Design an enzyme around this catalytic site. Structure first.
Site, PDB file in Angstrom:
ATOM      1  N   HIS A   1     -17.221  -5.949 -23.198  1.00  0.00           N
ATOM      2  CA  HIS A   1     -17.529  -6.736 -21.306  1.00  0.00           C
ATOM      3  C   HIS A   1     -15.914  -8.006 -20.950  1.00  0.00           C
ATOM      4  CE1 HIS A   1     -19.272 -10.238 -22.523  1.00  0.00           C
ATOM      5  NE2 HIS A   1     -18.370 -11.105 -21.861  1.00  0.00           N
TER       6      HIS A   1
ATOM      7  N   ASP B   1     -21.950  -3.845 -25.895  1.00  0.00           N
ATOM      8  CA  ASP B   1     -21.587  -4.258 -25.344  1.00  0.00           C
ATOM      9  C   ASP B   1     -19.947  -3.776 -26.340  1.00  0.00           C
ATOM     10  OD1 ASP B   1     -19.477  -5.956 -23.741  1.00  0.00           O
ATOM     11  OD2 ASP B   1     -21.178  -7.394 -24.250  1.00  0.00           O
TER      12      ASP B   1
ATOM     13  N   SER C   1     -17.227 -14.345 -26.443  1.00  0.00           N
ATOM     14  CA  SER C   1     -17.787 -13.064 -25.921  1.00  0.00           C
ATOM     15  C   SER C   1     -17.007 -12.458 -26.937  1.00  0.00           C
ATOM     16  CB  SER C   1     -17.554 -12.617 -24.657  1.00  0.00           C
ATOM     17  OG  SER C   1     -18.656 -13.116 -24.740  1.00  0.00           O
TER      18      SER C   1
HETATM   19  C1  LIG Z   1     -26.255  -8.830 -19.093  1.00  0.00           C
HETATM   20  C2  LIG Z   1     -25.813  -9.899 -18.468  1.00  0.00           C
HETATM   21  C3  LIG Z   1     -25.991 -11.403 -18.489  1.00  0.00           C
HETATM   22  N1  LIG Z   1     -25.587 -12.534 -17.908  1.00  0.00           N
HETATM   23  C4  LIG Z   1     -27.211 -12.527 -16.443  1.00  0.00           C
HETATM   24  C5  LIG Z   1     -28.635 -13.046 -16.446  1.00  0.00           C
HETATM   25  C6  LIG Z   1     -29.299 -13.386 -15.677  1.00  0.00           C
HETATM   26  C7  LIG Z   1     -29.393 -14.893 -16.125  1.00  0.00           C
HETATM   27  O1  LIG Z   1     -27.985 -15.599 -16.615  1.00  0.00           O
HETATM   28  C8  LIG Z   1     -28.218 -15.157 -17.181  1.00  0.00           C
HETATM   29  C9  LIG Z   1     -24.534 -13.290 -17.437  1.00  0.00           C
HETATM   30  O2  LIG Z   1     -24.364 -14.626 -16.453  1.00  0.00           O
HETATM   31  C10 LIG Z   1     -23.260 -13.256 -18.622  1.00  0.00           C
HETATM   32  C11 LIG Z   1     -22.860 -12.224 -18.280  1.00  0.00           C
HETATM   33  C12 LIG Z   1     -21.513 -12.306 -19.146  1.00  0.00           C
HETATM   34  O3  LIG Z   1     -21.268 -10.885 -19.602  1.00  0.00           O
HETATM   35  C13 LIG Z   1     -20.753 -10.019 -17.834  1.00  0.00           C
HETATM   36  C14 LIG Z   1     -21.621 -13.228 -20.496  1.00  0.00           C
HETATM   37  O4  LIG Z   1     -20.315 -13.574 -21.365  1.00  0.00           O
HETATM   38  C15 LIG Z   1     -21.013 -14.524 -22.145  1.00  0.00           C
HETATM   39  N2  LIG Z   1     -20.033 -15.275 -23.153  1.00  0.00           N
HETATM   40  C16 LIG Z   1     -20.271 -16.493 -23.059  1.00  0.00           C
HETATM   41  C17 LIG Z   1     -21.651 -16.301 -23.943  1.00  0.00           C
HETATM   42  C18 LIG Z   1     -22.669 -18.204 -24.261  1.00  0.00           C
HETATM   43  C19 LIG Z   1     -23.836 -17.297 -25.042  1.00  0.00           C
HETATM   44  C20 LIG Z   1     -24.010 -17.040 -26.189  1.00  0.00           C
HETATM   45  C21 LIG Z   1     -22.936 -16.171 -25.922  1.00  0.00           C
HETATM   46 CL1  LIG Z   1     -23.754 -14.480 -27.298  1.00  0.00          CL
HETATM   47  C22 LIG Z   1     -21.944 -15.687 -25.806  1.00  0.00           C
HETATM   48  N3  LIG Z   1     -21.812 -15.281 -21.835  1.00  0.00           N
HETATM   49  C23 LIG Z   1     -22.531 -14.843 -20.480  1.00  0.00           C
HETATM   50  C24 LIG Z   1     -23.550 -15.033 -19.029  1.00  0.00           C
END
Ligand SMILES: CCCN(C[C@@H]1CCOC1)C(=O)c1cc(OC)c2oc(NCc3cccc(Cl)c3)nc2c1
Ligand SMILES: *[C@H]1O[C@H](CO)[C@@H](O)[C@H](O)[C@H]1NC(C)=O
Lengths: 27, 250, 11
Positions: free
Chosen positions: B43, B99, B198
């Site tokens: 991603h 991923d 990430s």
């Molecule tokens: C699978 C979709 C997740 N999502 C939706 C679900 C539904 C509610 O919110 C969670 C995201 O909003 C999302 C998507 C991402 O990439 C597309 C992200 O990347 C990161 N990286 C930073 C991070 C921070 C804390 C720990 C680690 Cl291990 C990495 N956080 C992301 C969050």
């Protein structure tokens, strides 16, 4: 062959400040 | 990294910064796995909901770094990408299943005190280390808080969490290709990855052979360092057949 | 931004 052995740590037998925390978790 | 600490010099010599061009900014973390191959999260490179779709020439890999923003003359090495390989079954639509992406560098990088590859686990490594309560280490130059940016590479050690607790912390479907890590609310201690981390490595030091292994790739979290949430990591061993297949072919 | 220019042999 040499993967995962850090030049400034394992290679010289020095430990970093928190690696012992990981070791202590490995029961 | 939230609630971590500054890395020591040479502490994570496989750490890689993915650096965007125009505009000059942090793209993601990554890791060095040989002199020619770098591992990251898919991603980081391809994510249609956020209009992310980086090609080879859009970014640079910066290896051997410590300071986030400095050009670390005589210490860091900057490499151009030859080719990006994204897992063909990377699930960006739903849950970031698989991923993972590899990047082959145009030219092999010279190893030094600050530049050195991490090991990848085999089946026995995973079975012995990937256990609830066992801690690994996450590193990166990402945000210090969910809502600023560090001067130097940040490090946090975090325990692997039981799969039911992982599953019960989110409405997202969690697969066998993912694991989660972080402290529970009543454990007191804190720490997480955050935006910009990430793609970076979750590493453990095997107490059998005293080597570091990359067990996970920083994938996603619901915010950063929130109580009752955990970070989700790509399970590197489960994706190793794909890794080997790619390196062997290309 | 906050990033120190890199030698433009990399660019
Ligand atoms: C699978 C979709 C997740 N999502 C939706 C679900 C539904 C509610 O919110 C969670 C995201 O909003 C999302 C998507 C991402 O990439 C597309 C992200 O990347 C990161 N990286 C930073 C991070 C921070 C804390 C720990 C680690 Cl291990 C990495 N956080 C992301 C969050
Ligand atoms: C860029 O390339 C990828 C190839 O997988 C594709 O999925 C993506 O949608 C493309 N983006 C645009 C904006 O054309």
């Amino acid at each position: 062959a040499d993967c995962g052995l850090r030049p400034l740590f394992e290679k010289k037998s020095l430990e970093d400040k928190t690696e012992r925390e990981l070791l202590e978790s490995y029961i | 990294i939230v609630e971590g600490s500054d890395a020591e010099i040479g502490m994570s010599p496989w750490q890689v910064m993915l650096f965007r061009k125009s505009p000059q900014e942090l793209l993601c973390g990554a890791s060095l796995i040989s002199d020619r191959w770098v591992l990251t999260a898919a991603h980081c490179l391809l994510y249609p909901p956020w209009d992310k779709n980086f090609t080879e020439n859009d970014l640079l890999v910066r290896i051997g770094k410590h300071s986030r923003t400095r050009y670390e003359r005589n210490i860091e090495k900057i490499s151009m990408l030859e080719k990006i390989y994204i897992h063909p079954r990377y699930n960006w639509r739903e849950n970031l299943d698989r991923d993972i992406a590899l990047m082959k560098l145009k030219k092999p990088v010279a190893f030094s005190d600050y530049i050195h590859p991490v090991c990848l686990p085999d089946r026995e490594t995973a079975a012995s280390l990937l256990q609830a309560g066992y801690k690994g280490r996450v590193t990166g130059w990402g945000n210090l808080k969910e809502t600023g940016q560090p001067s130097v590479l940040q490090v946090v050690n975090l325990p692997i969490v039981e799969r039911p607790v992982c599953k019960d912390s989110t409405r997202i479907r969690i697969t066998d290709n993912m694991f989660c890590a972080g402290y529970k609310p009543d454990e007191g201690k804190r720490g997480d990855a955050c935006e910009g981390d990430s793609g970076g490595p979750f590493v453990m030091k095997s107490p059998f052979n005293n080597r570091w292994y990359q067990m996970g790739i920083v994938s996603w979290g619901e915010g950063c360092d929130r109580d009752g949430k955990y970070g989700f990591y790509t399970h590197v061993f489960r994706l190793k057949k794909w890794i080997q297949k790619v390196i062997d072919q290309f | 931004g906050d990033f120190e220019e890199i030698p433009e042999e990399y660019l």
